């Protein structure tokens, strides 16, 4: 098969697609679009048999208008977007006998090279700035900034100038999208608008991906910021009650011989839980080449919940405590695509088994509390001790005999009370070693904050 394309827009079908492609192919495509223009490739879908040297099945794309080629691609990995130097592109697909899959869908479109701002950076030097800066940036402009660096380090971006159009309500006019990887769908560090200087941004990788969009009207000076490529560190302290993170280069295969680290801790007294939209690493009996260790607790010293490797997708991993540590290490040679990890923080049926003291805060806190919760914490006092209370913040919905939203307290089996309002409840003490806290919340709110409280033994 194979075809050549003139259209400004089009799609590109793997022969087998929607399922699956034939073994042993030699097919080729050629995409040509008007001059002074560029080809932008999207990538709806893409399965292929995987291969470290990338030999068996694979897809490569030469930059026709130029020497060199954009690369060869097997597996699941392939940047959601690619963009040519010229107005012409080679597109060869080539396979082998054993092993096939749903193939790939893949869109593309023409793009003027004037209106086309996209710029890559490496030098460990912040020369980077909104279009036209300090003059006013243009309208209907879009503009992208990838910045990659040395494989050890992290990126840390500071802002010098930043004045962008204000936000209508929770609607953005004009913004600066910052992502944690090197691709348009990597975790979201933040979107930034208006007139305040963004905080210092810090990565968890050596790649950063940025986009500045502007709408039909209204213009300002824009921004200017710089960056440090120093630490050789990678991973980070992950502070939100829920979030998402990335094995370097993802969805591209990761770096080798690196040991990345991530510590989940946010809301006091509520356990985290993991999950993966995608796992792949070196398969290994007994596991140990390149692996991913989770740890019930703040450091490696804590009880190791699991070590993972290979190609299979894990069962969610409920930490049993406040913190959760995660370390991953790779040996030189061999690299899988990597992982992507949704992680939520739970509160159903947790137990503090042993702790001298601590804090209990409703997950978001001080963010207003999630609708529809059946929350059940239980602090246990060793031996024949007890637990003193004291509250620090309280702000629930109101009355109806505390039948709308509420919070209960328990001394073992006995109830000590049911609370709500913005009234702070009394200190107290269990005559038991068991101490249960129940917070039941319904489906609406003015967005009352939650609660916070202390504990003893």
């Amino acid at each position: 098969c194979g075809e050549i394309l003139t259209e400004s827009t089009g799609t590109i079908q793997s022969p087998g697609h929607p399922n699956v492609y034939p073994h042993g192919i030699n097919c080729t495509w050629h995409i040509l679009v008007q001059p002074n223009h560029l080809i932008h490739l999207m990538f709806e879908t893409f399965h292929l048999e995987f291969h470290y040297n990338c030999t068996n099945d694979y897809l490569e794309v030469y930059d026709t208008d130029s020497e060199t080629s954009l690369g060869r691609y097997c597996g699941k990995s392939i940047p959601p977007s690619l963009t040519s130097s010229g107005n012409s592109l080679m597109l060869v697909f080539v396979t082998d006998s054993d092993l096939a899959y749903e193939g790939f869908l893949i869109n593309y479109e023409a793009i003027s090279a004037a209106t086309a701002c996209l710029q890559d950076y490496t030098d460990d030097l912040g020369t980077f700035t909104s279009p036209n800066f300090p003059n006013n940036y243009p309208n209907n402009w879009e503009c992208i900034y990838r910045i990659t660096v040395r494989t050890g380090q992290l990126i840390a971006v500071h802002f010098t100038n930043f004045s962008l159009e204000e936000a209508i309500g929770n609607y953005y006019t004009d913004f600066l999208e910052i992502r944690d990887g090197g691709y348009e769908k990597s975790p979201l560090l933040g979107i930034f608008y208006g007139s305040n200087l963004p905080p210092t941004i810090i990565s968890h990788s050596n790649k950063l991906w940025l986009k500045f969009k502007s709408d039909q009207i209204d213009t300002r000076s824009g921004f200017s910021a710089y960056w440090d490529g120093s630490s050789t560190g990678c991973g980070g302290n992950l502070t939100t009650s829920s979030g998402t993170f990335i094995s370097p280069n993802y969805p591209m295969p990761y770096y080798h011989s690196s040991e990345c680290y991530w510590w989940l801790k946010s809301s006091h007294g509520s356990a985290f839980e993991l999950e993966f939209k995608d796992f792949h690493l070196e398969h290994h009996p007994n596991c140990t080449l390149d692996y991913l260790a989770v740890y019930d607790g703040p450091s490696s010293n804590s009880h190791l919940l699991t070590q993972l490797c290979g190609d299979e997708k894990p069962p969610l991993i409920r930490s049993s405590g406040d913190s959760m540590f995660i370390k991953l290490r790779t040996d030189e040679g061999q690299q899988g695509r990597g992982f992507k990890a949704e992680y939520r923080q739970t509160c159903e049926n947790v137990v503090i088994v042993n702790q001298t003291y601590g804090i209990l805060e409703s997950i978001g806190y001080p963010n207003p509390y999630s609708e529809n919760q059946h929350c059940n914490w239980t602090i246990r006092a060793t031996t024949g001790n007890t637990v003193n209370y004291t509250f620090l913040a309280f702000d629930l919905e109101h009355h109806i005999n505390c039948s709308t939203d509420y919070l209960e307290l328990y001394d073992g089996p006995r109830q000590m009370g049911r609370y709500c309002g913005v009234d702070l409840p009394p200190p107290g003490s269990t005559t038991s070693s068991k101490l249960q806290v129940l917070l039941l919340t319904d489906g609406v709110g003015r967005r009352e904050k939650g609660f916070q409280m202390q504990w003893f033994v």
Binding site: Y171, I217, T404, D442, G443, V444
Partner: protein
């Protein structure tokens, strides 16, 4: 164009009166009507003079943004000076902002009235708001509601025609962009049978389409729609005077846009005088799964004399038989809204109402108009928009 066949005109002056008759001293004063009868030329000068005086005396603080726009506009068509209401709305609209792009589409129906009425007093002074509004409306991404699409196009058409001489090439281009995008969304809802969106939304939409600067790709079959609406009046679908008020203008070949051109004292014509059942059972569920931790799924069955009993009788009779089906009601320009069932009340800050559906698909008449069939299952879900 699709001006009403003179043959069919009697059919029109019909409802015109049937609407004007709804105006009494205890009726809820309905601006939409006074605009409608001013636009169409009022028969009942006693009625018109009555309902004007009511709107004049209205208290500014009981008026939401939409109310207020409607009112300014309604007064304007009676050649009465709103003056003060305009100041107020103007101040209220500087400070105006929507919620979020995932927020509901009708959230823009209210502001569409404000802008429209405001643009009509002062276009140049309205520009900022009109821009803020368009940018946002466009960006919003909830499921298109036609009623709102239609009103937005009036507000937005008016502004589009009043770009101050000199203004950066940009306003018009933004307004028009949104205007086209909206008109596409609308033609896309014209049924293979003349209706745009649905019946009660059709009148608004007719206005919209016959006024936007850029027509839809697929050309709109006006004559079809205007004929469809006409047979549909023979069929008694337009008894509720508010709904009359929302098609009367199109039928009289007008839009809220012509309000500033209303003339006063034409001296209108007298529209000449034109002169068993076994009670049924309906299954009535009332379900709360949203408010507090005290909620309901309680179903029930009742008898309602003949058909021709409207859903409200079912409600009242359920209320009477069983105290759990108590409900409380509240009056509006469209009529009686069920505001609370079982002490669970709609609340604005929760964006939370009582929705009535037939088994599973939502109703589209108020309980005081809707007529249930011999073994129908009506459920009332407390839910949100």
């Amino acid at each position: 164009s699709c001006s009403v066949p003179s043959a069919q005109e009697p059919l029109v002056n019909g409802i015109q009166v049937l609407m004007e008759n709804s105006v009494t001293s205890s009726a809820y004063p309905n601006p939409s009507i006074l605009i409608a009868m001013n636009l169409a030329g009022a028969y009942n000068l006693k009625a018109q003079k009555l309902l004007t005086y009511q709107l004049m005396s209205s208290d500014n603080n009981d008026l939401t943004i939409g109310h207020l726009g409607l009112t300014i506009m309604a007064l304007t068509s009676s050649c009465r000076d709103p003056g003060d209401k305009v100041s107020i709305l103007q101040r209220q609209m500087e400070n105006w902002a929507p919620s979020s792009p995932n927020a509901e589409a009708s959230a823009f129906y209210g502001p569409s009235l404000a802008i429209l009425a405001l643009c009509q007093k002062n276009s140049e002074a309205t520009l900022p708001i009109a821009v803020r509004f368009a940018k946002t409306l466009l960006a919003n991404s909830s499921p298109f509601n036609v009623d709102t699409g239609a009103m937005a196009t009036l507000a937005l058409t008016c502004m589009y025609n009043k770009i101050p001489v000199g203004s950066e090439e940009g306003y018009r281009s933004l307004f028009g962009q949104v205007l086209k995008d909206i008109v596409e969304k609308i033609s896309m809802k014209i049924k293979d049978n003349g209706i745009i969106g649905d019946i009660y939304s059709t009148g608004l939409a007719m206005q919209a389409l016959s006024v936007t600067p850029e027509p839809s790709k697929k050309e709109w079959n006006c004559k079809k729609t205007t004929d469809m609406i006409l047979n549909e009046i023979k069929q008694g679908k337009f008894h509720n005077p508010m709904s009359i008020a929302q098609i009367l203008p199109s039928l009289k070949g007008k839009t809220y846009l012509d309000v500033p051109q209303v003339t006063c004292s034409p001296d209108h014509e007298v529209q000449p005088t034109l002169p068993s059942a076994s009670n049924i059972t309906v299954i009535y569920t009332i379900n709360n799964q949203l408010r507090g931790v005290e909620l309901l799924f309680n179903e029930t069955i009742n008898v309602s004399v003949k058909s021709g009993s409207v859903l409200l009788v079912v409600l009242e009779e359920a209320q009477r038989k069983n105290p759990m089906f108590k409900f409380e009601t509240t009056m509006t320009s469209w009529g009686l809204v069920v505001s609370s069932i079982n002490n669970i009340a709609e609340n604005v800050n929760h964006k939370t109402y009582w929705q009535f559906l037939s088994g599973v698909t939502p109703l589209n008449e108020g309980v005081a108009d809707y007529i249930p069939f011999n073994h129908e299952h009506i459920t009332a879900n407390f839910t949100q928009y």
